[PDB]
Amino acid sequence: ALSDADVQKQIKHMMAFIEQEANEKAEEIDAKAEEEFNIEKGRLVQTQRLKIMEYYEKKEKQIE
Amino acid sequence: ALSDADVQKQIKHMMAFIEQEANEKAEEIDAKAEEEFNIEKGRLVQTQRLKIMEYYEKKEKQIE
């Protein structure tokens, strides 16, 4: 029973709310991606660096 | 009841009932008796026949 201005305003606001969430979610996903990159990276790095460390240490004992 | 005619008739009827049951029961008793006669006789006779059968087998067994 109201003017087209009021629906245009309200729908513009609804669209803005969605676009806002739309942006925030992508940003959130990439930030987590950066975190997981470093976390997973370190786990892999420590795992094999330690493995070869022990491998070669034993070889060093054999050498001595 | 009060009237002798009625009580006397009732007595005749009762005795008639008593007689009918008595008559039927005695015939029933004799019929079952005859059935059992034949049944029991056969039972004992067959039992004996089997016993004789065993004496026979022993006879057969001692020779060849």
Place this chain on the structure above:
Amino acid sequence: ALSDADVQKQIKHMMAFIEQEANEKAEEIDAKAEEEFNIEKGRLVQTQRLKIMEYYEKKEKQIE
């Protein structure tokens, strides 16, 4: 019709009543005291007299 002196006599009477009971009660008490005295004494003397005798009799074993 009777004087205050006879009432006084009645008082003196009840006093005499009391003295009689007083005497009877004390006598009863002293008699039981003497009975308990003798009972405990007899028990004790019998107990020890018997033990002394028993000791000597047993010592008869070396003498015999």
Place this chain on the structure above:
Amino acid sequence: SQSQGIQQLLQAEKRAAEKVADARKRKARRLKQAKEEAQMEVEQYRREREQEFQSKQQAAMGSQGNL
């Protein structure tokens, strides 16, 4: 009719007693007949079988003798 009715009752009871006692007597006789017949049956059976055995025995002894 009081006394005649009483007599009539006693007579019915009497008849009942006779009927049953006699039935028991017939049962016993029929049973005795059954024992007599069974004995006869067993007797014929026995005679025949013994005869069969003897016949076989006679043949067996003949067979045994041949040598």
Place this chain on the structure above:
Amino acid sequence: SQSQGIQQLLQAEKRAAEKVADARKRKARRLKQAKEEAQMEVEQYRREREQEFQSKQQAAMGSQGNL
């Protein structure tokens, strides 16, 4: 004088109470005395039996000589 007759009777009661309580005290005393006297009697009995024993021992040494 009612109050006085009553008081005089109460005094008699008091004395009665005293007389039996004192009797019970004596009873306790007499019982302890009984125990001490008993022991004194025991000691006398002991002395007598000691004497009999010693008498018997001297007699035994004297008498066994013959055997």
Place this chain on the structure above:
Amino acid sequence: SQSQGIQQLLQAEKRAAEKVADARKRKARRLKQAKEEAQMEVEQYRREREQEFQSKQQAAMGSQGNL
């Protein structure tokens, strides 16, 4: 006019689906990259430990010969 507001909302939702799927796609690429870089670091780490190994081995041989 309510249907246009609905369509604008539906378009916003569509965009939301594209945007989150796209962020998740980037996330996956970054993860693969993470594995690649970690591995590059590992290859360099191995080289370094190896250089140390090789130095020690040759050095130990000559000193053992001098013994």
Place this chain on the structure above:
Amino acid sequence: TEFWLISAPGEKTCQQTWEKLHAATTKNNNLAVSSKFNIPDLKVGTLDVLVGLSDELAKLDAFVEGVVKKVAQYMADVLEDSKDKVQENLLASGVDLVTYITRFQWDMAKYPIKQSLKNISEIIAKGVTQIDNDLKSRASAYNNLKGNLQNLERKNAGSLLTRSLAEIVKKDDFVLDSEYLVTLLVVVPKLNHNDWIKQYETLAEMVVPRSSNVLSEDQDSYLCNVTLFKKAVDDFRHKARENKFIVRDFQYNEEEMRADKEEMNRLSTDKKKQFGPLVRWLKVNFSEAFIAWIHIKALRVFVESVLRYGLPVNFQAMLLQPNKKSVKKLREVLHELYKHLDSSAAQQEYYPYVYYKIDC
């Protein structure tokens, strides 16, 4: 179908025949219907046993009477191509009550003519027990159909606040597959149609005014859909309650709508398929129970006739259909005919004749 079955002393069969068959002798001056009744000759070995059976028979009588009334009720209950006043009674073995009775015979189908009295009673009892259990199961099925059908009528009945919207809501109008916008259903009095649309705006923040649109109308109210951001629905519904407005929590469900339409058709079809054969089965049970009932009455007749007369046992009896307002006279005539024959001393206490009631 109220008939009296009367036992006679039977002193002379030709005489009893005259007194029962002759126009000059037909009861109530030949206005009442008088038919002869006969049963095969049967003997009972012991009267005391007969007495026990008499009591048993009366009990069985009551049982089967209960059974047949139950039957009458279940047929009445289905109302399939029938009504309370039309085809109230069914034929037994294809004929009517009077026809059945006059043509009634002891059925070897019911019991061997050589079957023991005990055994006859047993056959009847087992039969009707079997009938009773059949009635129990089929009636259960009937009631289950009736119950679920009414439950369905109720589902498709009522006001828009509670009625199913399967016929009302269209997929194009209900906001489907929206993550953020939830559609609530509101019922607004017609006189307040525009008011609640405005009210909705005031129920929660971020509620779009004028989105409320009527999908269908009820007699008292319009049912409208309202679209709003999901987060605000809690505020929307709460304030609606504050404004004395009921917001319907409703979700479009295509599968449920179809499921309900399927149950609607399924239940109606099963209803029809069941009543057809249900009633045919019931009809057989009815015919069998009536035949049994008459069998029972006849046995009671045997027992009673023996008990009054003993031997010999030619039994004469009448099946009478009284004329209106002449039963007193009918009784009086039978009393005159038999009272002096029953006893010199003088119903249940005494009875000129033995009779039992038929009323179906």
Place this chain on the structure above:
Amino acid sequence: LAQLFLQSEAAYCCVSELEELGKVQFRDLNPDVNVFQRKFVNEVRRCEEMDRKLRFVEKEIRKANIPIMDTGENPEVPFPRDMIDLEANFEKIENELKEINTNQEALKRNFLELTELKFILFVAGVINRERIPTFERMLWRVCRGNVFLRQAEIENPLEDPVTGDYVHKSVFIIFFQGDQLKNRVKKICEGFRASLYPCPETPQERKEMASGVNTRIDDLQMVLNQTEDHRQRVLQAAAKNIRVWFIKVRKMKAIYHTLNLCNIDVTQKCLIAEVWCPVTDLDSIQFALRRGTEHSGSTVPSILNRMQT
């Protein structure tokens, strides 16, 4: 008025004598103290038991129309302590009557029963004939005409046990051989007020049995006559004792009441009471005190202590 100090033994005698003399009134000195507290509880309870026993016997005495006078014993006023045990003996006498009545009624029932055997010597019963009309018709209808009607009558009958009424019996009985129907008629005939006690038999053995019972019945009657003679002898004896005991017990109880109506002293086993007495009878009462206490062995002065108040 005056405070009277009476030794307990003397007190029983004094209260007794003064109560019969009747010129003094005692006050209750311990209103907060109950009869238990006054120590007449055993005395009052005893009196109450004797009273209840006496009333029971009295009632039975009246029932027997015994001409008891109760015009003697007025001046004896016994107050011995032995009465306590004698009152119990009185109860034993009364207890015996209950036992007699107990046996007599039991005896009556057997008598009430046994007479039926003589009238006995199908099972016909004996009825009071008040409803033989319906007895017979109701049995007919159990299974009508099924068994023959047995008619039995008793002339000059014995008092019916249920009503103690003598009325000739005219009974129409149905008896059945069948067990279901015999059980049925048993139920029917027993629901009716009818006695079916005997089980008649053809064998003379049952007649011999009835003859034997008739003998036992006559013996029973002789026993009843003996039980009644004792009953009568005991009841007349009770009327003679009871007239005396009414007074004895009533008076002793009254004495006990007064004894409760007292102040119990603590220093002496003596009761002292405030007693009012007219001046006119003061000599009479002092002489009465002398007589009372003189009978008693304690010879306590039993002085009235005159006081102002």
